[PDB]
Each structure stands twice: as structure tokens, then as C-alpha cells.
Design a protein around this nucleic acid. Structure first.
Ligand code: VO4
Ligand code: VO4
Lengths: 319, 319
DNA sequence: CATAATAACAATA
DNA sequence: TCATGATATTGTTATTATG
DNA sequence: CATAATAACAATA
DNA sequence: TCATGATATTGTTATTATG
């Protein structure tokens, strides 16, 4: 197995921070860089164990989700520098109790939300705002409009979505399109990786499909295209966050702050309410429109957080 | 650790089959009996491994679910004969790939049902039959009535349910009762083991609570009380199956045979439709009324197989 | 001259 | 189902003994 | 004399 | 989220350099 190599992506990010005008030092990227270099020439399992144990010691005071996230970075560096069959990958992982506890915490939150859904009272107003955004000249605003109307992830809308018209028999479908460029698949066998599938939209098909060409053909739109997740996060995340805060501040449900992924949840909740055939369940429909892995009905649970005021009203009428 | 002991329950079942008038020989119970005895005095891990490997060889041609079920019997015998800390329990288990494949098969079936729900057209008729059963003099029929009206498992209805009136403020609740005696909990920490919780009923509270006293105070009803699962299965399973087949043959949905657990599914589907507050999801409500483990929303997925004709009709009306 | 009884066999939650 | 490696339930059919 | 920028820090699906 | 031991996304805040 290889005992020499370099995590190119980490080094390049460090070298760019060399001549920055302001901001934190890349202390974490640095530790990963040094960690990888100290591994060059290492062939003893007990040596590799001592090196990892040291990094783990530093991370001590961090939150559990943080350490879990930080472990992924080290692991991805090792794969980049040494490949997938390096013995370090058996050592540099979280403990089993760490992942078991994270899973437990995760499900507890989802379970708490399923028992206390938030009534999205002004949801039609939120949808209207999103619709108006589709006609904005700021391609950022156009993207936000598309998130609400297509339910696609921000990274998908801005960097890699392929929106095409869906056939309806011999005509073109009015309340659905075709989408390609599903993110997060990890290239799984039963995923939507590289697969074009049909999705519902919350406004006219022609309106959505035209607003996306304006997004694609704009200036910022061509910078965005094909971008890595890290570049997108650094270029657009904080501005999109602030923009979404402001657009929705007064109409979004008081229980929570307005958030980009709030639009993805709402999209599912509204699209089920409007388009779901009677022979499918909510879990199955959610999984279908959100592009989830084959036979997975569990991920859908995460997205169920809202209740439409119309459904609320008559569940209160069923005495 | 103990190296001597006997699985009493297995021996007793074999000794009873000694003077039977008809029926199969207990070949499986016999192998388990011999297996346990051959273990007396064994202290070598390689010996224990060879003994298990032989039992596994016999089971070869059986179905996967069968072998998994048969492994539980051997494992329970070992625990009964030698206790929970016997090294055989590390050896006598299915392979990891066996359980992974069973899980996969399990979810695939649930996923197929969520995408092709059965319309329970004559569900009100089924509920009426169940209601009429509550007034039958055959305590078997009364039990069937209670399954449909309370959604409790057959083993719970017949052997160990404790039905009590639920308070509504200062009065007594009309469409709910209190239930104790949840089965299958494996005495888990977050389960309903030994816990009395409130459940909805599909007919008047007074009607259900009176039909159960007639069940309890009957003759067959006192034989049933406190019974083990194996005795219940042998005493009542095949008769209840046949009785349920006949009662519902012509009104039950054509897609499937009428089955006792069909009433438990229907109970959930009908009780959500009628009594569920608007701030809870279907998964959460199902989990609550069916008595599931804390924070578990995944088990509910199993019970979602039907769609009410009333919901079907207007999901077809939402164009 | 065949059918009730039993436990194996199997699947579901 | 509780737990995430399995168990406890429910559901189906091949054997057996028997005037 | 303080605020824009950056990556750490963190959480969600 | 895909897989069931983790990764790839989204979301929040402490540091830093700077006339
Ligand atoms: O039986 V499952 O709840
Ligand atoms: O993002 V989750 O589908």
C-alpha cells in the first residue's frame, strides 16, 4: 500500500489563505496538512495510532457533531493522499459509541418535531414571494425563487441542476419538469446519481424553465456553474442566508428563523397536499419528489416539520 | 461460567408430544434438546463451534426467515440452560450477511406497499361486523370484535390486556380507554412495558369495556388469561385464523386475504383519520396508538398499507 | 377407506 | 419490534396417528 | 477609532 | 443522506487584518 502522497486540495486552500486581507487562520487545515505529511513513510500500526490519538486530543473541547465533521475531513485527506486501501483509514475514525449517540440524538429531534409540527400560516405568501423572485434581475434572487418552486437544494439550483420540460402524453406538463444533478448521492447504486427524474413544481412549468435560463446565462450564474461545494459555500452561503432572512422575516412562522432549507421542507408539504395520488403514502411521495435512495422511507421523516393551515383547520373540525 | 443445565421448556414440550394421537414429530425441539445436552461439560471454543456448525448444516434447505427464527430458539434454550454469559451465545448466531439481507428484504416489501396502498372500500362494513362481534356469546368472536375496535394484538386481547376507562376532565372519555399489557417490548427502557397508556377506540367506550368483562369472566376466557405465547398459538391460532377468514371473506379488499393483523392496520388508519390532532404526523400518531418505543417512527411504516375510500375519492378530486 | 391434530415451516413488526 | 443484530409475535402447510 | 472578511465551529439529511 | 458507520450538504459565530 502507498505510504507517500499529498492531499492537494488541502494544500491549495492553505496557500490561498497565505495572502488574505482578513479572517481566521486555517488552523484546522494546517493540522490536517501536517498530519498527512507526518504519515509519509509510516508503516507501523502503533505509530499511526499514536499520531491519530494526538489529533483526537486536540479536538477534545469541540462539539460532538463538529468532531464527527472534522473526522470526515481527515479521512477524505487520507483518501486523497494515500488512496482507499491505506491502513490509517481503519484507525482514524470515531468510536462506535460516538456514532451511536449521534444517531440517537438525531432521531430524538425528528421525533420531537413529528409530535409538534409548526403551522405554516402564511405559506401562500412565502410561495408568492418565491414566485416574484423568478422575475428578479439579481440571479441570486432567481435562485431563491427556484428553491421554493422546485424544492431543489441550494447547491443544486446554483451549480448543477438541469431543468427540462416533462412530457405529458403528447403535450408538455404544466405542473412538473425533469431534473438532473441530484447531490449527496455518494454515487450509491440505488440513488438518483446521473439520473433524470420528473419533479412537481409549485408554479407554471414555463415560468420556472425560463427563470432558470436567465440564471444560467447571467454572469454570476456562469461563475456558479460546475462549482465545488467548498467554493459555493465560501462565495454565496452567507449572502444567501442574509437575503433569505430579510425576504421572509415578517411572514415566516414565528417558531423558527427563515432558512433556505425551510423552502425545501415547505415544497414537500405543499406538493404532497396538491399533487399526490391516493395510492402512495406521504413518506413514499416525499422520498420520490426529494430524490431519495431506493426503498428508503426513513429520510422523509426529516422533512416533515410543517402543517398547512388548511389541514390544521379541518383536523380541528373533525371534532 | 456454567457448563451444566437443562432447557426445561423444551424438554417439557417433547415429553408432552410423547403421548400424542396425531401430528408431526417434534424433530426441531429434539435437535435443540440434544444440542443443549451435548453442551454439558463443554469448555472448548473449537468444540462449541463444531457443534453449532453441524446444526447449521441440517437447517440448510430451510427459508432464510425460518433459519433466523430457528436460531432464536437455540439461543433462547442456551440462555435457559446455561445463562446469559455462556460463550456459546457468541458462536450460535446468524452471519452478519444473513441479517443484513433480511433487513433489506424487509424494507423492500414495506417500500412496495407504500407505493401501492390497498383501497379498503368496505371498511365501515368490516368495522360493523367487529362491533356486532362484541355482543356475541362466543368469547372468541368477542375477542375478534375487540381486535378491530381496540387495535390490540390477538395475544394481548386474549391473554393479558387490561382495559380501563379513561378520564376526560371530570367525566369518562367516550372514544378512548386505558390499556395495559403491551407485548413484544422485550422489556426495553423506552417501551410501554408495564405502562398503562390511553388509546382510541372505534366504538363507544362503555361498549368495549363491557364486552371485555364478558370475555374475561367466560370459561375459555379464564383458560386464556396469563397464557404463554406458545400455548395461545397452539390453542387458538388456527381457529381464529379460520374464523376471521369466514367472517370477512366477501367484504375484505380483494387484493389480500382477511387476516387478524389486518384489523390492527385498519385500526390505525381509521383512528388517525378520525381522532388525530393537527400538530402530529401520521408516523407519530401511529407510533403513539400502537404503543411503540420512545422516539421510534420507523416501526409505523410497517402498518401503513391501506387507504380509506373517502381519502382516495378527493385526492382524485384534487385534480 | 381420510381427516383432525400437531409441530414444522415461514413471514411480519 | 427493539435495536441497528437480533427477538417476539403472527401466519401457513407437511406429517403424523388413528376404527 | 470598528467592521468586512475568513475559516473555525456546528448542525442537518 | 446513504447506509446502518459514516459522508455531503446546510447553517452560525469567533478571529483576523486592515487607513
Ligand atoms: O406489532 V407491531 O406494533
Ligand atoms: O437533503 V435531503 O433529501
Amino acid at each position: 500500500y502507498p505510504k507517500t502522497g499529498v492531499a492537494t486540495s488541502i494544500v491549495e486552500k492553505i496557500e490561498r489563505a497565505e495572502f488574505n486581507t482578513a479572517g481566521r487562520k486555517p488552523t484546522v487545515l494546517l493540522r490536517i496538512a501536517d498530519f498527512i505529511a507526518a504519515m509519509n513513510g509510516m508503516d507501523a500500526k502503533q505509530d499511526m495510532q499514536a499520531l491519530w490519538d494526538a489529533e483526537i486530543a486536540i479536538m477534545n473541547g469541540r462539539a460532538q457533531t463538529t468532531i464527527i465533521s472534522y473526522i470526515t475531513k481527515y479521512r477524505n485527506a487520507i483518501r486523497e493522499a494515500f488512496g482507499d486501501d491505506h491502513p490509517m483509514l481503519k484507525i482514524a475514525t470515531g468510536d462506535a459509541a460516538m456514532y451511536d449517540e449521534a444517531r440517537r440524538v438525531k432521531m430524538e429531534k425528528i421525533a420531537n418535531k413529528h409530535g409538534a409540527l409548526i403551522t405554516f400560516e402564511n405559506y401562500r405568501q412565502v410561495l408568492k414571494i418565491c414566485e416574484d423572485c423568478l422575475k428578479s434581475s439579481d440571479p441570486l434572487m432567481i435562485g431563491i425563487g427556484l428553491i421554493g418552486m422546485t424544492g431543489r437544494r441550494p447547491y443544486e439550483v446554483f451549480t448543477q441542476a438541469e431543468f427540462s420540460p416533462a412530457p405529458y402524453g403528447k403535450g408538455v406538463s404544466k405542473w412538473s419538469i425533469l431534473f438532473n444533478g441530484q447531490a449527496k448521492t455518494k454515487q450509491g447504486e440505488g440513488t438518483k446519481f446521473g439520473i433524470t427524474y420528473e419533479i412537481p413544481v409549485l408554479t407554471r412549468s414555463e415560468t420556472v424553465l425560463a427563470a432558470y435560463k436567465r440564471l444560467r446565462e447571467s454572469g454570476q450564474g456562469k461563475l456558479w456553474h460546475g462549482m465545488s461545494i467548498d467554493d459555493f459555500s465560501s462565495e454565496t452561503r452567507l449572502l444567501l442566508r442574509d437575503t433569505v432572512f430579510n425576504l421572509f422575516e415578517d411572514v415566516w412562522p414565528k417558531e423558527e428563523l427563515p432558512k433556505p432549507y425551510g423552502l425545501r421542507h415547505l415544497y414537500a408539504e405543499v406538493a404532497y397536499h396538491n399533487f399526490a395520488p391516493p395510492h402512495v403514502t406521504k413518506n413514499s411521495y416525499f422520498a420520490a419528489i426529494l430524490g431519495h435512495n431506493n426503498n428508503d422511507l426513513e429520510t422523509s421523516l426529516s422533512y416533515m416539520t410543517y402543517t398547512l393551515p388548511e389541514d390544521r383547520d379541518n383536523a380541528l373540525a373533525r371534532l
